[PDB]
Amino acid sequence: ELDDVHDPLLAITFELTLRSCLYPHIDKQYLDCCGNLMQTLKKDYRLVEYLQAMRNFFLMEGGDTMYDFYTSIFDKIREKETWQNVSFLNVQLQEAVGQ
Amino acid sequence: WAKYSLDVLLQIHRMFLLRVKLMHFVNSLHNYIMTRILHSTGLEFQHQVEEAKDLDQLIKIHYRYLSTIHDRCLLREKVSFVKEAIMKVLNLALMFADGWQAGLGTWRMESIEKMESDFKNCHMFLVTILNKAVCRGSFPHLESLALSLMA
Amino acid sequence: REIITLQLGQCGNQIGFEFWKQLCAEHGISPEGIVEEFATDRKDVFFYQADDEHYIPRAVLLDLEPRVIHSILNSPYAKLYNPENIYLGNNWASGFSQGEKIHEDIFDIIDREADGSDSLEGFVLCHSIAGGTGSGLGSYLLERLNDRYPKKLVQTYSVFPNQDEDVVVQPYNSLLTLKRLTQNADCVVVLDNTALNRIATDRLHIQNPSFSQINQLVSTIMSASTTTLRYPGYMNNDLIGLIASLIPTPRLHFLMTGYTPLTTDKTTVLDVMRRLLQPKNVMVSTNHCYIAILNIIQGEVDPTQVHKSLQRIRERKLANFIPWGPASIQVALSRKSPYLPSAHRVSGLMMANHTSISSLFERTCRQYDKLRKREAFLEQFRKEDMFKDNFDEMDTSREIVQQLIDEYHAATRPDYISWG
Amino acid sequence: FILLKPVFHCLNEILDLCHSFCSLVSQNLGPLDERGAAQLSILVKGFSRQSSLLFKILSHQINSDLAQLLLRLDYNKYYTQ
């Protein structure tokens, strides 16, 4: 109802200042929406958790899960030349999900 | 893989010495990359994204954090000058552990002196490459590891 | 892979008991083994997981002529440690012989735990050198495990006995144990009774009840030495990965201990390092040198200052060492746990390879040599004589330990490139 | 595995040749060499052939299918041959 909010505040050489009472509506809308993005992406589709996952027990930080994953792939017994069997790799990852 | 391979690993006594002359170097590189660069940087990223309040700035800060880890780890800019040295002295470790297995004496390895000289001179090249950073380059990131204790 | 602790002998069982009790209090575990209600840690490796959150450690408690194992049983933590794996002289030969007859059943007890675990990396022995029943049996079992598990590794938290020199056969017993340990043990962490007693006099007035109180000091060392495994980290997420740094050559696998706040009952990393390298904090009693040193710090540690601290220690130059190995020192970090007191917020420990321990080995070799010439205590009990008529495994141990002493001093020499 | 034609169309004949053998043994308790021996030797060789063929095929890589191999690999019986 942005036009029906501009007009009320209008109804109470100050022309630039008249326009200056129409920008705080955009500022409030963005202030609620910047919230909306970050809160939505942290309470509903958790962004801090998705990123802290992307760091820990994943590519950045091994932890112990990635130790359990890595030793199996290093092991020379029953190892194919490049050991690129995707089903085996995926199975090892699900064994080492640990969460 | 390199540290674990030299871990999986363990003239006949001189091999035991060369193991040690190698593990120090690889473990020190691992120490720098694993903690000094990635952990410390990830901590201010974790803290600062709390303060950040924008969808676009949250992208910008994330891109800065990735552009700084990817640079502080020796993986951009000069590659033949720096990276291949660490790669080849890693490759020597990989051969050194690939050509050995646990529990016998008769390895019949006469290349031990060749690999000694190789590791020694490539190490000389590595430390001199890092010392060249004094004139130009990322001195905070390099002069921290250039103090590798040499010998 | 999960670690199994093979606590044996009266003293070894006492220290394993205290160590598992310490890790009960430290972790979210009660004396009944149930998860704590008040309770982020890697409890997989050391504690087996029951269905009802009964966290039973993988402890193998071996008793011979049991006296203190009954006291272990009548304790609140008896339900905590229930794998139900306890199976019934002061001489090394007597202990070895007694172990041989029951070797199959105790080894079946070993097998069961190795099997119940998802996987197995290591056997950690709470071994007692010259421990009467503990020694001999521990040497025999040490000889068995490497054969049955060639790929696997054995660590020994040997409490090397120095009590200012009662048992009259201590040098003989310790001599044979060290031979078995030198050739059949992947790692050893050496501790000293006189050294810990001296620290006891230092920090407290306790003199007469040394053993009871020194148990706590030993337990602190044992727990702190494993904390980086028990709690995940950026580095040293496995026993062997840590061990590689500490043991540079297979023969020289005996490790020095140290702890910054011996009176652990804010300090910067610079401060704790320069405190730690001092000899008072060390817990053990011609040029001499370290081979390699490692330090782990657990507390409120600033990250940016740790590398600057290592630089500062390099300038500060306390640790004097010119070994054949380049390894000097690396600063490592572990997490201080919650729920326990955080007194001395920053608190640290060090594991090292030092040539000084050759002196302590040579002291018991000196006692043994004198005793051997006097021939005062051959024991010559019918057990001792029948088991060893030749009495030549003593000489084999003497030459093996003499090789070890010479190897230590050769490590001090600039030319360990040649055979040591 | 009914979806894929080859495995289905070979396990079916594995079962059908066994039906025929079951009939042959069912015929008499007295020994039968009255051409039964000829087709029986043919049968054992043919069944070994197709059984080893499907062994080679077994060895999406689902856990059930790949794990089923080691029951027979216990003896290594068909691979060793």
Curated annotation (Swiss-Prot), chain A:
Please list the tissues where expression of this protein has been recorded: Widely expressed, with highest levels in heart and skeletal muscle and moderate levels in brain.
* Subcellular location, record wording: Cytoplasm, Cytoskeleton, Microtubule organizing center, Centrosome
Q: Which family does it belong to?
A: Belongs to the TUBGCP family.
Task of the protein: Component of the gamma-tubulin ring complex (gTuRC) which mediates microtubule nucleation. The gTuRC regulates the minus-end nucleation of alpha-beta tubulin heterodimers that grow into microtubule protafilaments, a critical step in centrosome duplication and spindle formation.
Q: What is said about its interaction partners and assembly?
A: Component of the gamma-tubulin ring complex (gTuRC) consisting of TUBGCP2, TUBGCP3, TUBGCP4, TUBGCP5 and TUBGCP6 and gamma-tubulin TUBG1 or TUBG2. TUBGCP2, TUBGCP3, TUBGCP4, TUBGCP5 and TUBGCP6 assemble in a 5:5:2:1:1 stoichiometry; each is associated with a gamma-tubulin, thereby arranging 14 gamma-tubulins in a helical manner. Gamma-tubulin at the first position is blocked by TUBGCP3 at the last position, allowing 13 protafilaments to grow into a microtubule.
What's the protein called, per UniProt? Gamma-tubulin complex component 5
Curated annotation (Swiss-Prot), chain B:
Q: Where does the secretion signal sit in this chain?
A: none
- Tissue and organ distribution: Widely expressed, with highest levels in heart and skeletal muscle and moderate levels in brain.
The highest taxon in the source lineage is Eukaryota
Subcellular location(s) per record = Cytoplasm, Cytoskeleton, Microtubule organizing center, Centrosome
Q: Which family does it belong to?
A: Belongs to the TUBGCP family.
Subunit details for this protein? Answer: Component of the gamma-tubulin ring complex (gTuRC) consisting of TUBGCP2, TUBGCP3, TUBGCP4, TUBGCP5 and TUBGCP6 and gamma-tubulin TUBG1 or TUBG2. TUBGCP2, TUBGCP3, TUBGCP4, TUBGCP5 and TUBGCP6 assemble in a 5:5:2:1:1 stoichiometry; each is associated with a gamma-tubulin, thereby arranging 14 gamma-tubulins in a helical manner. Gamma-tubulin at the first position is blocked by TUBGCP3 at the last position, allowing 13 protafilaments to grow into a microtubule.
Relate the protein's function as given in its record.
Answer: Component of the gamma-tubulin ring complex (gTuRC) which mediates microtubule nucleation. The gTuRC regulates the minus-end nucleation of alpha-beta tubulin heterodimers that grow into microtubule protafilaments, a critical step in centrosome duplication and spindle formation.
- What this protein is called in its record is Gamma-tubulin complex component 5
Please report the organism this UniProt entry assigns to the protein: Homo sapiens (Human)
What part of the full protein is here?
Answer: 833 to 1019 of 1024
Swiss-Prot record, chain C:
Q: How is it modified after translation?
A: Phosphorylation at Ser-119 by BRSK1 regulates centrosome duplication, possibly by mediating relocation of gamma-tubulin and its associated proteins from the cytoplasm to the centrosome.
- Principal cellular location given in the protein's record: cytoplasm
Q: What is the effect of changing L360P?
A: In CDCBM4; the chaperonin-dependent folding and hence the yield of monomeric gamma-tubulin is compromised
Q: Which UniProt keywords apply?
A: Cytoplasm, Cytoskeleton, Disease variant, GTP-binding, Lissencephaly, Microtubule, Nucleotide-binding, Phosphoprotein
What does the entry list as the binding residues for GTP? A130, G131, G132, T133, G134, S135, G136
Phosphoserine modification sites are S119
Task: Give the GO molecular function terms.
Answer: GTP binding; identical protein binding; microtubule nucleator activity; structural constituent of cytoskeleton
- What are its GO biological-process terms? cytoplasmic microtubule organization; meiotic spindle organization; microtubule cytoskeleton organization; microtubule nucleation; mitotic cell cycle; mitotic sister chromatid segregation; mitotic spindle organization
Q: Which cysteine pairs are covalently linked by disulfides here? A: none
Q: Which PROSITE patterns match?
A: TUBULIN (PS00227)
Q: Cytoplasm among the record's keywords? A: yes
Write down the InterPro entries for this protein, in alphabetical order: Gamma_tubulin, Tub_FtsZ_C, Tubulin, Tubulin/FtsZ-like_C, Tubulin/FtsZ_2-layer-sand-dom, Tubulin/FtsZ_GTPase_sf, Tubulin_C, Tubulin_CS
Q: Where in the cell is it found?
A: Cytoplasm, Cytoskeleton, Microtubule organizing center, Centrosome; Cytoplasm, Cytoskeleton, Spindle
Cellular component annotations (GO), alphabetically ordered: apical part of cell; cell leading edge; centriole; centrosome; ciliary basal body; condensed nuclear chromosome; cytoplasm; cytoplasmic microtubule
**A Pfam short name:** Tubulin
Q: Give the protein family.
A: Belongs to the tubulin family.
For this entry, the protein name equals Tubulin gamma-1 chain
UniProtKB/Swiss-Prot annotation, chain D:
Q: Where in the cell is it found?
A: Cytoplasm, Cytoskeleton, Microtubule organizing center, Centrosome
Q: Where is it expressed, tissue-wise? A: Ubiquitously expressed.
Source organism superkingdom: Eukaryota
Q: What function does the entry list?
A: Component of the gamma-tubulin ring complex (gTuRC) which mediates microtubule nucleation. The gTuRC regulates the minus-end nucleation of alpha-beta tubulin heterodimers that grow into microtubule protafilaments, a critical step in centrosome duplication and spindle formation.
Q: Write down the disease named in this UniProt entry.
A: Microcephaly and chorioretinopathy, autosomal recessive, 3: A disorder characterized by congenital microcephaly and chorioretinal dysplasia associated with poor vision and nystagmus. Variable ocular anomalies include microphthalmia, retinal folding, retinal detachment, optic nerve hypoplasia, absence of retinal vessels, round areas of chorioretinal atrophy, and attenuated electroretinogram. Most patients have mild developmental delay and mild learning difficulties.
Would you identify the family this protein belongs to, as annotated?
Belongs to the TUBGCP family.
What is the protein's name according to its record?
Gamma-tubulin complex component 4
This chain's source organism reads: Homo sapiens
Q: Which residues of the full protein are shown?
A: 573 to 657 of 667
